[PDB]
Symmetry: D2
Subunit: 331 residues, 4 copies
Amino acid sequence: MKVGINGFGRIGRQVFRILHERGVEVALINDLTDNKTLAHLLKYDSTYGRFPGAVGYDEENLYVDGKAIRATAIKDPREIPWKQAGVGVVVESTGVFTDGEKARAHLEAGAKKVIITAPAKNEDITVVLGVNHEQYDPAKHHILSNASCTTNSLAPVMKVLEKAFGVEKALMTTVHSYTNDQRLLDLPHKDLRRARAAALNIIPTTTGAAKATALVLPSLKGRFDGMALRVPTPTGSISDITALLKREVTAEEVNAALKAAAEGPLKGILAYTEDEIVLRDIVMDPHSSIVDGKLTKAIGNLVKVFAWYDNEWGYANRVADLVELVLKKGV
Amino acid sequence: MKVGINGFGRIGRQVFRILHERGVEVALINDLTDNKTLAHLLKYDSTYGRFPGAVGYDEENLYVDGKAIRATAIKDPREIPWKQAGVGVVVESTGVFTDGEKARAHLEAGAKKVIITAPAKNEDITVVLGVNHEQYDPAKHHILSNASCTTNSLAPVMKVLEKAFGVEKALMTTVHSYTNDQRLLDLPHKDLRRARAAALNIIPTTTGAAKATALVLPSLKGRFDGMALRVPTPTGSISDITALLKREVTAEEVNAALKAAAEGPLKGILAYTEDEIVLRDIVMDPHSSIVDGKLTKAIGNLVKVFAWYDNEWGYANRVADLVELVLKKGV
Amino acid sequence: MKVGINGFGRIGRQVFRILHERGVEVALINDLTDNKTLAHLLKYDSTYGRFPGAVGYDEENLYVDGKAIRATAIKDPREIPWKQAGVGVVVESTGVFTDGEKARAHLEAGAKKVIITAPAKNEDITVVLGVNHEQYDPAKHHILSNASCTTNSLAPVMKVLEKAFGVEKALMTTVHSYTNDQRLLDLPHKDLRRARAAALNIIPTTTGAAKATALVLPSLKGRFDGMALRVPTPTGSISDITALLKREVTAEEVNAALKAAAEGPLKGILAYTEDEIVLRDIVMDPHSSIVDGKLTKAIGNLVKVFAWYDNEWGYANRVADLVELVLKKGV
Amino acid sequence: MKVGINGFGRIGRQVFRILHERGVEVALINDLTDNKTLAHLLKYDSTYGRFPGAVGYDEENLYVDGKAIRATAIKDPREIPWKQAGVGVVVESTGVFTDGEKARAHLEAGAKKVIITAPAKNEDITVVLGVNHEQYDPAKHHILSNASCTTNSLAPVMKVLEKAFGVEKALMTTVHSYTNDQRLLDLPHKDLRRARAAALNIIPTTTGAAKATALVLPSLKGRFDGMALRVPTPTGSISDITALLKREVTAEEVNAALKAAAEGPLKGILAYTEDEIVLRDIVMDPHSSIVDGKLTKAIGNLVKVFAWYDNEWGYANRVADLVELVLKKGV
Ligand SMILES: NC(=O)c1ccc[n+]([C@@H]2O[C@H](COP(=O)([O-])OP(=O)(O)OC[C@H]3O[C@@H](n4cnc5c(N)ncnc54)[C@H](O)[C@@H]3O)[C@@H](O)[C@H]2O)c1
Ligand SMILES: NC(=O)c1ccc[n+]([C@@H]2O[C@H](COP(=O)([O-])OP(=O)(O)OC[C@H]3O[C@@H](n4cnc5c(N)ncnc54)[C@H](O)[C@@H]3O)[C@@H](O)[C@H]2O)c1
Ligand SMILES: NC(=O)c1ccc[n+]([C@@H]2O[C@H](COP(=O)([O-])OP(=O)(O)OC[C@H]3O[C@@H](n4cnc5c(N)ncnc54)[C@H](O)[C@@H]3O)[C@@H](O)[C@H]2O)c1
Ligand SMILES: NC(=O)c1ccc[n+]([C@@H]2O[C@H](COP(=O)([O-])OP(=O)(O)OC[C@H]3O[C@@H](n4cnc5c(N)ncnc54)[C@H](O)[C@@H]3O)[C@@H](O)[C@H]2O)c1
């Protein structure tokens, strides 16, 4: 019962480091490049620095302080040796198999459990650690999704605002660091905005993060939606939640409430703070959501809350977190 | 009856170019640097390119295609020769005399009318062209304020949402390009966030833009507030308006309504569009507010509207616009 | 005898606009995206602004102020209808057919002349307008290359330093804006440096620009090489030329010499200036090389010269310039 | 015999952290802001992260894990209580007292030794650890300078190229991250280039780093000069050294030579590497100079060498390093 990663990219590599630093052992790693490039990308990372440990590689492996790890370049899921490596849980992070209909291929090649690191489709269950994980059935579920980084920042907040003040309606905006899914200079893209130079523009882009948060929380079904603004930053994001509660409240109420959750039930997932912070202050923070108290606004029953989150490292800690759970309640 | 500029900086220089390209003649220009540096900053601009025309200078002047303009380096308002230059209307844009209590000094030195390009204090009237300009009394008013770039983007929108759907409550967020008021690297500032590296961070900062918009529109008094997020872009900004109307509406209603205003009463100030645009698409757009139709969201009576605006050039067109009005109804 | 473009990207689109604004008519445009995306990329450009004119499109065309232009999505050269469109000269700018061995396919499908906008291989002649264009034989040549933007900035300089002071040896460095060939965040690349986040790093990368300049100028064969440093800027570049002359000279000599060429023989290609400029000052400058006089250094016979150049617009003016020549001396 | 810092800015704060993590105790810290802002800038740093330890403050002090440190806001050197605090060695890093003629004021107020963290004037001795530190006379010297970050990167290299191949002439170029000395948007500056938007432009600026390196190494007197190019990066820089040796050599010779020095005599100051690195890979590297082997070029006796260096952290390690030496051989 070992882990495997398909899509050793931005998310893959972060999840790997976390799993490493936790003890979990990754048996195989598949991507589309030669193990040389994989070793160099793991070793030197532009956002989180050098890999804590020794990195080596040959035609068929990668070595992490000696321990070998199979590294393949198979672009067809069904053709990945998850079998002859004993890989049970797979972290599908290529961003191209976001639907069980296709990601099932990992099972019909060995794997016993598959975690899609992105908003999936036709999966067994989309889970947001801290919102609906206890709702995982090892018998029934086998193809999971860890939702999206935005969903993971919204959910812990919408949950607390529900079991305290109740939520009628909510619109949200997220100012998000760019990702490899955008373009460096104007170039073809299916989204005519993500096609524009990413480090030059503030780019408006759709996000199902909100509606998706309406599934892990049926409470907000059809009554929660949002927008996204890609901005010139390599990592780090903030969610702008504007929700109409079910009773007039004050910004100070809202906070002590989210603060409560932070230091109690949602501990480790949600965090609360009143410090004068900026983006670079939350980069590499494990949490899913970090509430900026001082920004909390409240005009009667119409509240506005802000939640910082590192769309890369934080999300990756949840993905690795999910692999632990799946392994603890394996099949 | 000629114009004068105090604070030949980012805003000053843009207002100058506009006034030039319109025919208006600036008699004197005061700042804190030698006329050499002034000539070089006007000539070569990093955002709007080279100055359309010939730029020269000597110990006492600047020359724009020959025509001389007095250029002084007097840091004390009362000591600026607005008198011996016949300067009637002054554009106070140093960002340091934002209150008539101090900006009055321009009058007790010559000037007959003073326009503060920023949220003023103790001024005669803060005006937002297209919202409450017809309310200018040349007899009573003499020290005006053109509000702020954010106010000028919000007002034209809040106005339309009032005379159509009525507004109960509204919270707004603005993702704003950085300004010379922030820091390049971490450095001392009265705001512990604007103190952080501006091209590196997404920086949360307070904005009275909303409450200020509650003055040009008493309708929203005490029921409109917002936040600001400084992001790594040199110019261009977007306002995120989340307002609770007085009746359930649809995003398509909201648009055709703002669109109406755009092509009618608020023409020239407000613009509406459905094109797939990004930040660099609105840089140097004269308008005060440009509605991004496609981003318009509506869950019943809770709406979310986005308005692009070039906090520099657009605002500067309003400032120059205000100088025309003041000159047309001079004293 | 009409023009055609294959690879309607960064360079393609700029060459198109130039050809348009010059009168030249492009008959067909091939790329890998739907004509919708092509129309949107031409219309709104993040660096050079909106396209001067009306842009429309349908399943089979693009319309520029009415005039229709065939727009296909054929990824196989031999399969492009250069025939049934009467396209004589083709601008191969996809960056994937940089060798006549493959780019010849444009001929065996219609075209009578092919211009490769990049360092080619197996081409008939690599030309650098102003250095060796008069050496074009319409009878023999049919597959040309316009070299590279770096080559086009170096050549006009190395030429002048040869026919004046003679050149023994020269090493050069270019600080170049990033290009679509690099990555937004760490990601797989054949060059383990261009694989790193482009807007975050200063990235060292090999450049054959120098050795290539040794072909258009056999004088420097085996005695000229250089390096390239990709830096966080979307467009604009500077070449750092360090050459050991054949006689001790002074910085003032070097300048008046390059200045001479600028205002004389190399006019229109090379420019000379002593103004205090920065990058944003040369963006969209047609020239191939713009000498920054004030930076000129000289310790005896070891000189250092700097040349600004807009790797996009300037190069594109040379590409369009080359299409004129090819058309003037067509086949 | 305790240390003191005047100018708790970018350099000051880094030197403080290093001195802290080394055990050295700073007695007093003077700047121009309230101890609140000082505590917040030390605590949260945009480039090097959170301060390793607890940070507190009151009207008269700062607390580092309890231990109190006097924090004043005296803009006049002679008026700093270096006396009633027993501060012997002062780190003058305000960037405004770069000449003993003025920095002497620290002595006539208490201090027994003053280190100017920048190219000084009228100082007793400018030292570059690893080049000419053993040449420090505690009896004669009392006002030192640690040179500049560029000087500290060049010197260790020029030294090795002298005691191996000899150096006839050398021109150098440095691509340097911006600093608080530049501007965020176009704004008045004595240097008409550093006046332009720093995160938007590649900015050419003079540097005495080379001539300065000609003092710590009289060998290159009048035969070494260079240029500087400020680029859009918050920290990290690379030096481009083009030197004409006294004998034809090969790039492989040059390297093994610099490599030798790196692992031997210049260990800890100079480093050598052949790894495929980019800027973000050297941020926070203690070294003064890190040679990028792979970039080494050599055409006979004309060589080109590149040296990475973190103009902030590395230089700060040298400054702290110098305070140790001064304390070990105190007065
Ligand atoms: N970037 C974020 O902050 C973030 C947050 C949450 C979820 N996600 C999701 O995680 C996924 C990966 O995101 P990323 O940021 O790492 O992007 P990425 O570009 O770094 O892609 C990951 C890796 O997948 C590899 N890949 C592509 N096709 C493949 C195939 N057929 N087989 C094997 N490997 C393949 C790519 O070469 C790349 O190295 C996406 O679906 C994304 O939406 C990203
Ligand atoms: N930046 C924007 O987008 C924007 C939009 C709306 C309003 N404003 C307001 O306009 C004002 C100026 O803004 P800016 O962006 O041009 O900033 P800026 O830094 O460019 O300042 C303008 C100029 O004022 C000069 N100055 C300072 N003190 C002076 C004095 N005592 N006498 C004469 N000149 C003096 C400065 O040297 C500078 O050149 C501010 O109050 C600002 O809040 C700015
Ligand atoms: N960027 C510069 O400054 C510059 C300067 C000089 C020369 N060049 C060269 O010009 C070429 C294009 O450069 P670019 O900057 O426009 O990059 P780009 O990414 O914008 O590529 C140009 C276009 O080619 C298209 N394309 C790719 N494969 C294709 C195919 N098989 N058929 C049709 N279209 C295809 C791409 O989709 C893209 O839209 C490269 O070879 C480059 O090295 C670039
Ligand atoms: N930035 C670098 O990489 C670097 C490298 C080597 C040397 N240096 C030199 O170190 C010095 C400081 O550089 P920096 O990058 O920290 O810049 P900085 O802007 O951060 O300035 C340092 C601090 O000095 C303070 N200061 C200014 N005048 C003062 C006064 N009269 N009394 C007390 N404090 C005062 C400023 O408020 C600031 O907080 C400069 O001379 C610089 O040239 C900088």
